[PDB]
Structure 1
Amino acid sequence: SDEIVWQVINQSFCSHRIKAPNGQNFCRNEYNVTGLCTRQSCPLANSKYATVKCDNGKLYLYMKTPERAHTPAKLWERIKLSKNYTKALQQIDEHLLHWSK
């Protein structure tokens, strides 16, 4: 499932963790929102997962649906986020309708 994915990477290895001297844990899986890693803040444990990234100057917001657990090739569905800040935050909001705050 996903609880079984989490516990096996919480301890017993998430092989992309950085243990900071602060005791903090950082998932470097390029698709996580918080650079830190915690339960449903890292993109492997969670099944519904949104993120903003940049490939060029174009800032896309990637989105991961549990529908696509079978196929990892097309996991992250992505949408361009205009360029003006105000309309982009509004653009963000509509995609995040009926999700976690």
Structure 2
Amino acid sequence: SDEIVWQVINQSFCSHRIKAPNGQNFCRNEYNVTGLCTRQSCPLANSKYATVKCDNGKLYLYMKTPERAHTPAKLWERIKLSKNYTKALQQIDEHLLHWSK
């Protein structure tokens, strides 16, 4: 359904999408990693998803699985990132093992 949801979001109204003067598009989706609203970018159009996002101080990796397409309250999984920059990038590569580039 993801490509159907994507073509609805693309060709019709993505509420988060913002149109630049350049022509480029920008999701205001809070989980969107890049600012853009593209095929890979919309968290709504993709069920496997990830995002570095900060709650008040600590930075958390947010994981989204197709397994929890229903129950959006229990949707996002949270991982506390390390304060070591190297260790936290290693943690990213661990939790995104066998995951896309």
TM over 0.5: yes
SS in 1 for 2:60: strand
The alpha-carbon deviation at position 56 of structure 1 amounts to 1.3
Distance in 1 (alpha carbons) for counterparts of 2:33 and 2:98: 18
Q: Any unmatched runs of 5+ in structure 2?
A: none
Distance in 2 (alpha carbons) for counterparts of 1:74 and 1:29: 18
SS in 1 for 2:63: strand
SS in 2 for 1:53: strand
- Calculate the TM-score normalised by the size of structure 2: 0.97
Count matched residues: 101
**Aligned-pair Cα RMSD in Å:** 0.7
The alpha-carbon deviation at position 87 of structure 1 amounts to 0.6
The alpha-carbon deviation at position 12 of structure 1 amounts to 1.1
SS in 2 for 1:4: helix
Distance in 1 (alpha carbons) for counterparts of 2:41 and 2:98: 18
- Calculate the TM-score normalised by the size of structure 1: 0.97
Distance in 2 (alpha carbons) for counterparts of 1:56 and 1:92: 20
Distance in 1 (alpha carbons) for counterparts of 2:84 and 2:57: 13
Distance in 2 (alpha carbons) for counterparts of 1:78 and 1:32: 15
Distance in 2 (alpha carbons) for counterparts of 1:15 and 1:87: 36
The alpha-carbon deviation at position 4 of structure 1 amounts to 0.6
4+ long deviations beyond 3 Å: none
Once the two structures are superposed, what CA deviation does each residue of 1:17-49 show, in whole Å capped at 9, x if it has no partner? 110001010001100110111002110001100
The alpha-carbon deviation at position 84 of structure 1 amounts to 1.0
Once the two structures are superposed, what CA deviation does each residue of 1:36-91 show, in whole Å capped at 9, x if it has no partner? 11002110001100000001120000000000011111111010001110111011
